[PDB]
Amino acid sequence: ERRKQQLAEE
């Protein structure tokens, strides 16, 4: 979930 939020942020 942190990686998905990361790739959504970037």
Place this chain on the structure above:
Amino acid sequence: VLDMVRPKAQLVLAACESLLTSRQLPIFCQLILRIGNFLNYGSHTGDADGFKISTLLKLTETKSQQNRVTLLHHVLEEAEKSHPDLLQLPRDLEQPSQAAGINLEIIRSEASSNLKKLLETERKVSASVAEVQEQYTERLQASISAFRALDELFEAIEQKQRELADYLCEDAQQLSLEDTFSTMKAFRDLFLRALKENKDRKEQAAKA
């Protein structure tokens, strides 16, 4: 695989034919076996009248008091003054040394797999359309002729192995060609190394 396999296979066949026609290896093993029977009196071993392939690598174990000249160096120092034809033993056995380390079973497995797969290929293309037939069948028939020539060469290698087994009269069922060529390659390197050490010893004595 026809480019890779068949000329080192011909080198293996030439190596086995050179071993069968080797004259100087009987005279050299005659001299080595006479010296080895002379050196080991007094024990149970005496009247020893035969030896395996692995004795040639064991010749350098017997060292003198100086720990510099072993038995092989003394044998070649006698052979250089006694029998210059007996120094031919690297040249007639150069081709097994080039054939040393050729794995015969894996290349016969690759050739047999290629032949059976191409026979399946011929069976499938015979049920295929005619343009694939006219494209490929002359190459397929030439390749199957090349594999049958290679299999006749493999049978020639097998019967030359049986002839070498009957010639040397060693352990025939244990007579692997690969191990004989590799241990003999170690022997040929020991031959050239001991000759180089003998000529370096002679040059050092001359300089001194």
Place this chain on the structure above:
Amino acid sequence: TTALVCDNGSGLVKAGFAGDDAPRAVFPSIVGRPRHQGVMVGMGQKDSYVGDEAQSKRGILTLKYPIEHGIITNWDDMEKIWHHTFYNELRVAPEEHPTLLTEAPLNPKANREKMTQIMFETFNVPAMYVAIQAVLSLYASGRTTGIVLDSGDGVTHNVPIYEGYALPHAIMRLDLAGRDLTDYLMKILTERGYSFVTTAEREIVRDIKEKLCYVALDFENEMATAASSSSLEKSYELPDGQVITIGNERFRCPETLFQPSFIGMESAGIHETTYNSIMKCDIDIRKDLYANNVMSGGTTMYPGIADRMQKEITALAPSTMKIKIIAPPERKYSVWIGGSILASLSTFQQMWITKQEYDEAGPSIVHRKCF
């Protein structure tokens, strides 16, 4: 539609189609995981390898042999092996082909129930039948009633069969097979002077067991000529150049089947478990048990096992001079070939277990259709 037959072996799982003369897939019963740690991408390397792919890349893989002595213990690895066996080895989906299956004899009932519920729930087969390996082994010889010796890689068993239906009271177990013979062969070749610590050495000793080892007609007479026999002593070449010489051990490795006191246990042999299993039946079937004695497995490829089984059953039973022990040349896969013969027939369509039978009866249908 053509049916699928797989022999879920302890050392070699075989798979193929019904009606074929030979199994199309023969792969060892191995599941490999990557031995070292490291992730990267490497164009999408698989997390688990099974079978021939696991055999091919086995240096960087730790392997698992999940069947212990015929009997299933680790079930997820069997599920992965069955997923390879359908989806990539034969390249099929199991929800339209009826699938014949094999069990070790004296299997626990929970193992059969778990096997049936994983076939019906996970793979969702429309039809499955569990058969004892000995019943299929008799079907490869082409008869329906008799006792069969089956020695695979896991365990040795003697099973009596009546009209295709086995008798679980008189099935007897001998706790050795080709893995135990392989371990004993490394033991007595180590006693001869060799050493096998690596993987490839164990595979070479397996191929030595495949090629050279045989059963003599007489153990004591061939001991009596063992030092004097010029044809007994064989050898083998490892591809890197190691030479393994084998002598009398060629008929000491399979004679562990005939006499298990060679290795240090007091269990009865493949002829003695057969004889004791024949006497534990009803009296009427016993002549049909002697008449249709089939050996099976890769542990029966030793040449001259037929006449030695003949001589040992001749020694124990005075009524069996002339009856011949049937040894097919293809009894490596006689479990699979008999599964092909059984599944390919049009008389087997009733004996399959439907999905609705498992849904209305539970897993215990494997006790009652497979018997």
Place this chain on the structure above:
Amino acid sequence: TTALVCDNGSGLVKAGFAGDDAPRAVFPSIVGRPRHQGVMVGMGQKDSYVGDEAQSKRGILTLKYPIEHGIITNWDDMEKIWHHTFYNELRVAPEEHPTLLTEAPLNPKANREKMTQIMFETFNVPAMYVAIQAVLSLYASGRTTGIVLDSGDGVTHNVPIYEGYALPHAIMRLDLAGRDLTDYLMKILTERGYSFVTTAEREIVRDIKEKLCYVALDFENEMATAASSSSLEKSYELPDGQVITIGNERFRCPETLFQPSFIGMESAGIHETTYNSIMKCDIDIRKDLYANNVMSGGTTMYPGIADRMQKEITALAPSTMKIKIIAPPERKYSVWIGGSILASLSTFQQMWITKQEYDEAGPSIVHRKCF
């Protein structure tokens, strides 16, 4: 967006955009500081020249290499190298571009810590990665398996790869590469009288090494040919117009790769390092490795190194087995070419080390997320 690949190698920096085959920015990694007295007034001249500007004006500069044997010594100089290769040469904002990086194996971990800290704080990027150079050098070759001898300017390292999997226990590192060959050539050029003491002259000796040196196929025969006749003698023109001539020093200088005892280091040559790396792997996985020796690095651009490497390995190895030295003509940029191949993949997009992940995990997730 488009990713950046910046191989910050020990002698030359190769930076460029992802998806391309030619690196846009190849320039040597030096910092040139003035040493004489300036008399001109009006500024324009800087206190530190970086890159090709320092190469052009090298006769009045002390040149400092920020990287010595794959380890960054002066972090301020290497920061200036990063600032020049991002803002001045490539001309891209780093905070809108992912940026792959390369690192030598068996490096000190605090060096990776400080690379990750500077690349996430000062030249702050949305995403970055640290990867082994030999893996990307194999990725240029279009294959999954093989051994890479990567010989850069500071580090010559041997890394095997099997089915896209590095074996870290078999990896070795050797501190002998192009800078040490330049130092040894600078030493042995004093035999003919050509003194070279300055850092400016080190680049001239490097240019002689690039243009005229080659690997001898047989060392002693080339000694005999060079001592016999002056056929191997070649002339070089200096920037001041003097023409020198060198003879056996064309092949006495790269032979330090095969005989390190010229420069006093005890450890063996690169062929023995590769051979010991292959026996450090298991026996069954060696079959690809001899068939897939893929060299890389600028030090492997001598036009006699492939045949010599084949000869030395074929001498050391068992002869039962195919030796193939796969040296592509573009093997200098094979680290960058493999980086541009790897960075243009969707499967890599989930494996980026990113800003917020660095913010929870500290600058130490590079030891965990990157292998």
Place this chain on the structure above:
Amino acid sequence: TTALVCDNGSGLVKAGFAGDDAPRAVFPSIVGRPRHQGVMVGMGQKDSYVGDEAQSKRGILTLKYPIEHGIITNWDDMEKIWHHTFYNELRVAPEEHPTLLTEAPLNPKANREKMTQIMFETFNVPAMYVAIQAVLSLYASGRTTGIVLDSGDGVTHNVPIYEGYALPHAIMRLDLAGRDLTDYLMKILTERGYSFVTTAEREIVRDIKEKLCYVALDFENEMATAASSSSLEKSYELPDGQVITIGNERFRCPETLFQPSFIGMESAGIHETTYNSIMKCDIDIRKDLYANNVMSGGTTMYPGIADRMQKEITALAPSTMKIKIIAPPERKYSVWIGGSILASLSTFQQMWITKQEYDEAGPSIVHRKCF
């Protein structure tokens, strides 16, 4: 007549007179040869330094170990080791003293032939004996039965022995000992930036392995303690005056003894090897072996190995019967102490191997006389 006890181990040769408690001549087994050139004429520049003179002058010497993995590989060097330990250290004539010798289990027969022929033909003795190192290690502990694990410099082997009867099948050998820990310490010390590549530096890494390393009782808790606080970091002063500081490498280096996957070996730790040695024995004598686990060899000098070894054995084995570790403080010389006990007996006069027995039976009576 005083006998001589001379353990010619892989790491350090320990020699002295029989009937004493401590060996007089303890010195490492290395042959140092000068890799550089000599310019200073005279003063006894002898071409091969052997023993402590090779240790003291090690900064200009290539050091060769004659023993590799418990196998006498180099024979001229090993003869120089024997000549130094007889003539320079003990300063005794070999022809007036019996010489007890030691050997590793599962040794080659021709190796025993070669040491017997050097000990009867070059260095003539009135008598000599070859004994298993684990058996003498048990005899130092004073008990007749037990299991001895011996971890030398190249071999860690397990020998269970019951009432003096050494079980041959239950002996096994794992090639993981002090030299492999030294090489792994070289591999992990480069993470902190300390490079050690020469054979001279192997003595320095072996010295810090001797002085600072210790077996962790639990690897994960010591990992968490080392990662959390820098309390366990210890400093060492190099011979050039530099001071290094090591952290988790004090326990990451012996953990290869329990986890061989660090250096890339598929085999399990020494506790599992001990356990599999115990299951190869008969079930009645296992109770004696579990309470009589005897360590020997200097690789057991790490001061946490006894409690961790007791924990691992008590966890792995069933807890029915007593687990007791026998770790005497003088177990480093327990081979020599057991040899001194065995040599000084009145009954040992008839198990000596005389010169007349050698003349009668070649160098082969040691096979039929000793175990």
